[PDB]
């Protein structure tokens, strides 16, 4: 996170300051490898 | 004649009276015999199937819709 320590936020609130701040939370990105089951061959043949 | 109704009537009596042998094991003697030969029809594609390997769902019955439930 990126979170701004802005002072006495309640003072410039009685000054009447709009504020803003750059600002991050928490983020996460996850990457997920999957394997592929592949068919190659088959042979025995059987019908029901 | 009056005499002659009362032989007539009793002889129908008599008649239909007559002893019912049990004509119900007779049928059961056909019916079972039926069945043996529709299930023992059966006996050469099992054996056969049973040499050769094949598996249960592997070996096809020429088995058809049949009465006395087989």
Same mark, same amino acid.
Request: hydrophobic fraction near 40%; include cysteine; proline fraction near 3%.
């Given at each position: =996170?990126?979170?701004?320590?802005?002072?006495?936020?309640?003072? =410039?609130?009685?000054?009447?300051?709009?504020?803003?701040?750059?600002?991050?939370?928490?983020?996460?990105?996850?990457?997920?490898?999957?394997?592929?089951?592949?068919?190659?061959?088959?042979?025995?043949?059987?019908?029901? | *004649?009056?005499?002659?109704?009362?032989?007539?009537? $009793?002889?129908?009596?008599?008649? $239909? $009276?007559?002893?019912?042998?049990?004509?119900?094991?007779?049928?059961?003697?056909?019916?079972?015999?039926?069945?043996?030969?529709?299930?023992?029809?059966?006996? *050469?594609?099992?054996? *056969?199937?049973?040499?050769?390997?094949?598996?249960? $769902?592997?070996?096809?019955?020429?088995?058809?819709?049949?009465?006395?439930?087989?």
């Amino acid at each position: =996170r990126r979170p701004v320590s802005n002072g006495n936020f309640q003072q =410039r609130v009685k000054a009447g300051d709009i504020v803003v701040a750059p600002y991050t939370s928490d983020g996460k990105i996850t990457v997920k490898l999957v394997a592929g089951q592949k068919d190659i061959s088959s042979t025995p043949d059987y019908d029901y | *004649t009056l005499i002659e109704l009362m032989i007539v009537v $009793a002889i129908i009596g008599i008649l $239909a $009276a007559i002893a019912i042998p049990q004509y119900q094991n007779y049928i059961a003697k056909s019916q079972v015999s039926r069945v043996m030969s529709e299930t023992g029809s059966l006996k *050469t594609v099992i054996e *056969t199937c049973i040499l050769d390997g094949k598996t249960a $769902a592997n070996c096809e019955l020429g088995w058809t819709n049949s009465n006395l439930l087989g």
